[PDB]
Design a protein around this ligand. Structure first.
Ligand code: OLA
Length: 131
């Protein structure tokens, strides 16, 4: 977990639009969500680990205890029952909302954080540079 903790900036995204569509994200948010390069800052608070995200649209904060379920109102408004754990190396973040399910597996590949969003059989991939 000590390797995820840093100020990250997005550098390259891929297939996110297709993923956003899959999630059923509204047109408006898709337009901003497609151009916006956000900053995901991951840090701690002892039993808590936080994930702040900053963009020229929305900034969203989640604080949780690993493996513990919690409620999170996603940026695109879905209210999910999320759980994020460490399946070893990878930081998995599961989001469940009215029957549908989705997951985010963040990794550190050659010192670059790579997130790989997934829903149904439509995967999306993101890249982050430690700034
Ligand atoms: C924080 C809002 C701006 C960044 C997200 C833009 C896309 C908006 C709606 C779709 C959400 C999919 C689940 C959240 C992914 C966040 C990715 C990130 O932190 O960069």
């Amino acid at each position: 977990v000590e390797a995820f903790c840093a100020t990250w900036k997005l550098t390259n995204s891929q297939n996110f639009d297709e993923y956003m569509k899959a999630l059923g994200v509204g047109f408006a948010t898709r337009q901003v969500g497609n151009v916006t390069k956000p900053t995901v800052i991951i840090s701690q608070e002892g039993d808590k680990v936080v994930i702040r995200t900053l963009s020229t649209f929305k900034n969203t904060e989640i604080s949780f205890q690993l493996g513990e379920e919690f409620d999170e109102t996603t940026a695109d408004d879905r209210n999910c029952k999320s759980v994020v754990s460490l399946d070893g190396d990878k930081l998995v973040h599961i989001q469940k909302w009215d029957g549908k399910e989705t997951n985010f597996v963040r990794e550190i590949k050659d010192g670059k954080m790579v997130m790989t969003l997934t829903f149904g059989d439509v995967v999306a991939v993101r890249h982050y540079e430690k700034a």
